Design a protein around this ligand. Structure first.
Ligand code: ZN
Ligand code: ZN
Ligand code: ZN
Ligand code: ZN
Lengths: 149, 149, 149, 149
């Protein structure tokens, strides 16, 4: 009924160890992709993670509901079809801004790579007809991360 | 490629006139709900709108992907089942913060009401088996607004 | 050093009573402006409030660090100098989007007014030479609110 | 005035080359810190950059108006005084969430390092008494970047 007093949000520190990477859900990827969830902002709805991708691996088709920013630290990544199809081809080290609405039918890694990314909102994985089969946000990502970890 | 130079985003002013309220899609509501899209932030993925709701009207079942804030200027609104079912019943004038993940089965207006609201991210409308039949973000809302208007 | 588990953020409901409006700080306004702080998002850094402005009142000079959106429910408001000086003159009911960087030397109310507003980030109040004398965000706003009521 | 139509925000790709690192302003750091601005969101108020910091270098005293997230790819970094003073001592590779209100009196790099970071809102640099002497956001950061091209 009344204004809710708030306290300063706690700062966080997460050491990234090779030992903590786990298999990324097979339902949403191809190839032995592994990852780590690094942070969730339940109030903002943003989340951050890091990924290791083998040569020839990819992610299932999805649309970004909000802006996402990536930092490719190792390898090469083809987004939105790669440069050969009007999209972008990233070489490490590099950065990218993938806006709200960005369609990623098959983000592909031709070489063993690694990339860090922050997402605002969910990733809507779609079927061959463009219908949403699953809306994956911080909560769904955290559920999967802890279910495997 | 290279860093993209940016300029100051333009400020906006929108007069709210009775003449511009249009019928809200029948697929996602019941009763003669009318509305007006006021602003869309394509970079942030946030959007803002105002609604006029007849007595007995409601919205179809949906989940808030991100935080949303409402200012009920007139009437009464039963959110998350209303006070009688553990949720809240807003009485004008009042404010509300509905967080990311909030499930709104049938937001109901017992009396003729009006409310202003800002949304971060999309509203995922679901069927009786939990499946997301439509992810409505700034882009989808603008499309429905301009198509009807 | 490890990932921090998060839980769904709590929803909020705030009844706005005429009895809870208190005097806005005299150092940052002129005339007899009264207000109420409605919500703070310590994680996002956004905050929301509502103001009652007497005829002839105004706010001290400031720059918006981030985007702010207002809903003028009563009266008239001159922002950025008003229409007569390249800015905007708002008439109730109306909406407005004031972007990051917006300079508000003396937001003025020629007539008794009222407006609701959401802010992302702080408002940097500046002196006549443009030097920042106070950066007011959700924390500073909550501090002033709890100290007066 | 009426609703302003919007279109999908353009995706971006930026190659991080050593050709682009330039000296960071000496008025806000000590040591030979170099950097690259990667992205500015004028609508959202967020911005992103990457820094190369020599052993013994540091940043001038500041407070984060909003949340910031970093990825330390090389070296070591002491934040909020280091674990020695109730803060954190980050070792590459590691991640950190520095919330709104975070006080960074003298972020220090004992060894040659590198870190990528996203900021929401400005960094308020303060004098010895705690007075804001400079509010640096995307616009101020872009100005410094373009100037020292
Ligand atoms: Zn994607
Ligand atoms: Zn809802
Ligand atoms: Zn202002
Ligand atoms: Zn800092």
């Amino acid at each position: 009924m009344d204004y809710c007093n708030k306290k300063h949000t706690a700062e966080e520190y997460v050491k990234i160890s090779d030992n903590n990477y786990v298999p990324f859900p097979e339902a949403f990827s191809d190839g032995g992709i592994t990852w780590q969830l690094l942070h969730s902002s339940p109030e903002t709805s943003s989340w951050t993670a890091i990924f290791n991708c083998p040569a020839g691996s990819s992610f299932a088709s999805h649309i970004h509901a909000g802006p996402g920013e990536y930092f490719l630290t190792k390898g090469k990544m083809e987004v939105r079809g790669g440069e050969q199809e009007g999209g972008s081809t990233a070489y490490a080290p590099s950065y990218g801004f993938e806006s709200s609405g960005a369609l990623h039918g098959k983000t592909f890694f031709p070489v063993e790579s690694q990339f860090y990314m922050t997402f605002l909102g969910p990733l809507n994985f779609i079927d061959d007809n463009g219908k949403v089969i699953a809306s994956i946000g911080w909560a769904e990502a955290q559920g999967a991360w802890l279910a495997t970890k």
